[PDB]
Amino acid sequence: RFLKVKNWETDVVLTDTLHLKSTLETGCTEHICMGSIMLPTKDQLFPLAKEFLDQYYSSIKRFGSKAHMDRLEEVNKEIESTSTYQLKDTELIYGAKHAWRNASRCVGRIQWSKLQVFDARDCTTAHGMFNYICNHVKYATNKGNLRSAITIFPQRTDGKHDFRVWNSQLIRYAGYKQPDGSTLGDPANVQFTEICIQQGWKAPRGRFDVLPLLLQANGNDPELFQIPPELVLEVPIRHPKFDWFKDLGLKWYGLPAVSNMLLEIGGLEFSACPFSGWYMGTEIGVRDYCDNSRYNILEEVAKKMDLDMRKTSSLWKDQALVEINIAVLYSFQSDKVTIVDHHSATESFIKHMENEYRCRGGCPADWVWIVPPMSGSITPVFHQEMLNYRLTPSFEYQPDPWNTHVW
Amino acid sequence: RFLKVKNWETDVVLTDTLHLKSTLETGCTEHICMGSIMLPVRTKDQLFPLAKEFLDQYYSSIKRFGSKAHMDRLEEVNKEIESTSTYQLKDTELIYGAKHAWRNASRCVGRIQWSKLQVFDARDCTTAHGMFNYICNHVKYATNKGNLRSAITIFPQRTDGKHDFRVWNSQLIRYAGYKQPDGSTLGDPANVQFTEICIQQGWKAPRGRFDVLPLLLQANGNDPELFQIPPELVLEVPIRHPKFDWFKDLGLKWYGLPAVSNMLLEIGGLEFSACPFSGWYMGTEIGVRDYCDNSRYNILEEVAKKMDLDMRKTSSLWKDQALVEINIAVLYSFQSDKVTIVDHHSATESFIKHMENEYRCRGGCPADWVWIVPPMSGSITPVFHQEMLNYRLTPSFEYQPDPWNTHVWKG
Numbered sequence: 077r078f079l080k081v082k083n084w085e086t087d088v089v090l091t092d093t094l095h096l097k098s099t100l101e102t103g104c105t106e107h108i109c110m111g112s113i114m115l116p117t118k119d120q121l122f123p124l125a126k127e128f129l130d131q132y133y134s135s136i137k138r139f140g141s142k143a144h145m146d147r148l149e150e151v152n153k154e155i156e157s158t159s160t161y162q163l164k165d166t167e168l169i170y171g172a173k174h175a176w177r178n179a180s181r182c183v184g185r186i187q188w189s190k191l192q193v194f195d196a197r198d199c200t201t202a203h204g205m206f207n208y209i210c211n212h213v214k215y216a217t218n219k220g221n222l223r224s225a226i227t228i229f230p231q232r233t234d235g236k237h238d239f240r241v242w243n244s245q246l247i248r249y250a251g252y253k254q255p256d257g258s259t260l261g262d263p264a265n266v267q268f269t270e271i272c273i274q275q276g277w278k279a280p281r282g283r284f285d286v287l288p289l290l291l292q293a294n295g296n297d298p299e300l301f302q303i304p305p306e307l308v309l310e311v312p313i314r315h316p317k318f319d320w321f322k323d324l325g326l327k328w329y330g331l332p333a334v335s336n337m338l339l340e341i342g343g344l345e346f347s348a349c350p351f352s353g354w355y356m357g358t359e360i361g362v363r364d365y366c367d368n369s370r371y372n373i374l375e376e377v378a379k380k381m382d383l384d385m386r387k388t389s390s391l392w393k394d395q396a397l398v399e400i401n402i403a404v405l406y407s408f409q410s411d412k413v414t415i416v417d418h419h420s421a422t423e424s425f426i427k428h429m430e431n432e433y434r435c436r437g438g439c440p441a442d443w444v445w446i447v448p449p450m451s452g453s454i455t456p457v458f459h460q461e462m463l464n465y466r467l468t469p470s471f472e473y474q475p476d477p478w479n480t481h482v483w
Numbered sequence: 484r485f486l487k488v489k490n491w492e493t494d495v496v497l498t499d500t501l502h503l504k505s506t507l508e509t510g511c512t513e514h515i516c517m518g519s520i521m522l523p524v525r526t527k528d529q530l531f532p533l534a535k536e537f538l539d540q541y542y543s544s545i546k547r548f549g550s551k552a553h554m555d556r557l558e559e560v561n562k563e564i565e566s567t568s569t570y571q572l573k574d575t576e577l578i579y580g581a582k583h584a585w586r587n588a589s590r591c592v593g594r595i596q597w598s599k600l601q602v603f604d605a606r607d608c609t610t611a612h613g614m615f616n617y618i619c620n621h622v623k624y625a626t627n628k629g630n631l632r633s634a635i636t637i638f639p640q641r642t643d644g645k646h647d648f649r650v651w652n653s654q655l656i657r658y659a660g661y662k663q664p665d666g667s668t669l670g671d672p673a674n675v676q677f678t679e680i681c682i683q684q685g686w687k688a689p690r691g692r693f694d695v696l697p698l699l700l701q702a703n704g705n706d707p708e709l710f711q712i713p714p715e716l717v718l719e720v721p722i723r724h725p726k727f728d729w730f731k732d733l734g735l736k737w738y739g740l741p742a743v744s745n746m747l748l749e750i751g752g753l754e755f756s757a758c759p760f761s762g763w764y765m766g767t768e769i770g771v772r773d774y775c776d777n778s779r780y781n782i783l784e785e786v787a788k789k790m791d792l793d794m795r796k797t798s799s800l801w802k803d804q805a806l807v808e809i810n811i812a813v814l815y816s817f818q819s820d821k822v823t824i825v826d827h828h829s830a831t832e833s834f835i836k837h838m839e840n841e842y843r844c845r846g847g848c849p850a851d852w853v854w855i856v857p858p859m860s861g862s863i864t865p866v867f868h869q870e871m872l873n874y875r876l877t878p879s880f881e882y883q884p885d886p887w888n889t890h891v892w893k894g
């Protein structure tokens with residue numbers, strides 16, 4: 077019931093007690109572990125609201141106060157009457173920050189308290205949504221000095237009036253299938269890129285075409301909008317030692333901005349809540365560039381290095397992987413765009429974890445996602461035992477809109 | 484109940500039904516995953532169900548379930564239990580059992596080799612000297628002049644737990660580690676405590692950086708005895724790099740034979756507390772963990788210095804750059820000396836094929852992702868993108884406490 081987590085590199089042991097407040101289920105059972113699986117009414121709503129407001133007033137050292145009691149009362153009133161309720165701005169801000177704080181797969185949570193929250197609950201149209209997203213992007217990019225932010229659109233009602241951003245990130249490159257069987261651009265977006273064209277997008281059929289936004293307001297049909305290019309800060313990729321690198325023609329964007337998740341606060345569901353921070357180097361260089369199902373350029377970089385690609389045991393893949401990540405980190409720092417290497421980030425997360433164990437009594441963490449895709453065991457998170465469980469408020473996954481949307 | 488696992492690189496989906504035959508716990512609950520946690524006297528009462536369950540498996544595998552041969556064996560075992568509180572495995576059962584323990588080892592990326600395991604029955608062993616001889620023969624056979632062969636040696640099973648056989652070493656071959664007055668460490672930091680135990684037990688320590696530890700062997704619950712493995716039986720590989728001539732000057736070498744000796748083999752309710760098993764190394768085990776862990780030989784610094792990497796900011800990825808060269812060197816050295824070894828790309832690719840095969844013919848393959856995924860270059864191996872189910876089948880290898888923490892000293 078009270079749990080121990082050991083670091084095996086430093087022998088340090090923390091005691092987790094926060095997990096006893098775990099509400100949601102994990103997929104796992106006493107018989108089977110699923111830690112590596114990617115995705116496993118009025119009555120319902122009242123307790124959910126109470127649990128939240130309780131922890132809120134607790135955080136502000138005003139638990140059991142009349143302000144607490146009165147709010148619990150008032151929210152209770154509003155639910156019995158309207159079958160839902162609205163969050164005060166302070167609650168909303170607390171809720172968003174805490175959903176990040178509870179994101180077990182996020183290595184960047186040491187920054188959790190410095191989240192800019194833009195309240196877009198007054199939004200009513202796709203054009204209104206577009207305005208808010210543009211402003212989000214601009215605030216967050218900040219000429220390269222990136223800042224964490226979330227923009228929150230109206231909460232779900234009867235499920236027929238959902239607000240959705242159909243893109244998975246605010247900023248991604250298009251994917252096109254070629255007649256010659258291969259793929260141009262980003263293969264991960266071939267379907268979304270189809271839907272865009274299917275909805276009227278004029279694709280320049282290039283390799284790094286910033287996708288248009290597809291915005292759905294109030295359960296309506298989704299509309300297309302192009303982000304002003306001047307707001308999409310991109311970084312050309314060069315190597316600090318290999319001149320030929322530039323010739324590969326690689327660039328990537330500076331703003332990672334997740335837009336398809338569902339924010340749940342106090343039993344309320346915010347289906348459109350795009351949020352952004354800044355990249356860890358490996359996300360781009362390792363995943364985006366070198367994954368087979370992506371830009372998959374390892375072979376090309378390897379050939380320009382003239383490494384022996386005759387036998388896997390020359391580790392040419394690994395050698396190429398390193399230069400590529402060296403270059404990505406190099407380009408961003410050169411262009412003065414915020415980015416963090418996997419060493420510094422994981423070290424930050426260790427400090428954060430210790431902080432959370434000390435001031436909160438634990439920190440839900442998912443080892444499978446915290447450990448970077450390269451160099452895993454030379455980072456301190458590798459040797460860190462972690463406990464995974466789900467606390468609310470939270471970001472949850474949600475189905476792709478196109479499967480759901482009644483047209 | 485069916486369970487689906489997906490590969491996100493290939494979209495190959497698999498169905499698990501094998502998890503239904505799982506009985507042991509995992510550590511996880513509906514409200515917590517402990518999947519990244521490293522660690523999660525038996526009566527006639529629970530013993531016979533365990534016996535029966537095993538013998539049913541065994542006779543299914545040889546296509547003789549429900550046979551008279553099957554039934555007589557059950558009644559044989561039953562009577563042996565109620566009259567002697569334990570029972571003895573036939574040799575055929577012991578072999579079947581050890582192979583399956585490996586096959587069920589959810590943390591082992593090397594399980595594709597599981598059917599080819601030489602099993603040495605050391606159950607007639609009664610003394611430490613007898614243990615030394617068995618272990619020496621295991622090492623000689625397994626090493627096979629560098630053309631390594633998988634093997635396991637099985638010593639007598641636990642009885643009342645007051646007469647255990649144990650190998651006190653964690654691996655049959657390992658380098659000493661000595662803590663110095665100034666706080667630093669000579670040798671392998673992982674083995675400091677064991678080295679001390681040995682030294683206390685009368686081992687004369689050469690005190691170098693690559694001293695092969697002696698065997699500390701407990702037979703029948705008696706106090707353990709020291710034995711030195713004959714050096715001619717200890718295959719070692721000088722580490723050098725194919726491009727970097729200064730690399731040999733680092734003075735590194737490693738032993739060829741990975742051989743785990745502190746685990747507990749459970750078959751049909753029987754506990755075999757001494758069961759050293761060995762295979763061959765995956766490159767990263769040496770080049771990533773043994774050399775580059777902070778709490779091990781920690782040569783990342785020096786290698787990076789000699790490559791003259793930019794070590795002022797970690798953003799140069801000097802740590803990663805050096806890590807790769809060390810692993811290239813480990814592979815290059817073993818291959819050049821014709822000592823069997825596998826790189827992490829070949830190993831994980833093979834495990835993936837094995838796994839898919841296990842799903843088809845067997846209905847599943849329990850796998851611990853946290854352990855299967857290699858400790859460098861993780862996402863450019865196919866296992867990174869593979870959803871895996873973890874659960875516990877028997878027979879199995881279990882951890883067991885260190886013997887110096889439980890042993891009752893005789894004198």
Ligand code: HEM
Nearest residue numbers: 176179181182183184187224225351352353354355356471
């Ligand atoms: C500020 C710097 C940030 C860094 C360095 C960072 C880093 C990461 C990384 C590396 C992942 C792993 C996902 C993958 O590799 O595919 C991740 C996931 C995640 N991050 Fe953070 N992030 C940052 C900001 C944020 C912010 C501002 C939020 C929310 C307010 C957030 C919420 C999440 C969530 C919910 C996930 C899990 C998403 C999923 O399940 O796919 N992150 N983050």
Ligand code: HEM
Nearest residue numbers: 585588590591592593596633635760761762763764765880
């Ligand atoms: C023959 C080639 C083999 C290879 C390449 C191999 C590879 C590995 C690796 C890399 C690990 C994880 C090690 C680590 O944490 O550093 C492992 C774990 C394991 N292997 Fe294998 N192995 C092989 C043979 C065997 C054999 C013959 C057995 C038993 C008969 C076996 C049983 C196990 C067990 C029980 C574990 C879990 C160890 C632990 O929890 O500490 N392996 N294997």
Ligand SMILES: Cc1cc(N)nc(CCc2cncc(N3CCOCC3)c2)c1
Nearest residue numbers: 244332333334336351352353354355356
């Ligand atoms: C804010 C942020 C910063 C950062 N450095 N990295 C990410 C991760 C982006 C990201 C990571 N993993 C899965 C998704 N998807 C969108 C959510 O649904 C699954 C796919 C997105 C997000």
Ligand SMILES: Cc1cc(N)nc(CCc2cncc(N3CCOCC3)c2)c1
Nearest residue numbers: 653741742743745760761762763764765
């Ligand atoms: C047989 C075999 C082959 C191979 N290539 N690699 C290993 C490594 C097994 C291994 C890895 N890590 C810790 C332990 N220990 C044994 C259990 O107790 C802790 C030490 C064992 C074993």
Ligand SMILES: C[C@H](O)[C@H](O)[C@H]1CNc2nc(N)[nH]c(=O)c2N1
Nearest residue numbers: 458459460461519520521853854
């Ligand atoms: C905390 C975590 O479980 C621990 O560091 C594990 C992670 N994965 C591992 N994987 C392997 N192969 N070997 C290990 O020792 C570990 N250690």
Ligand SMILES: C[C@H](O)[C@H](O)[C@H]1CNc2nc(N)[nH]c(=O)c2N1
Nearest residue numbers: 112113114444445867868869870
């Ligand atoms: C199958 C496996 O769970 C899948 O590849 C996971 C593994 N770990 C990950 N870790 C991060 N950071 N991001 C990911 O997308 C994944 N994918």
Ligand SMILES: [Zn+2]
Nearest residue numbers: 104109511516
């Ligand atoms: Zn689990």
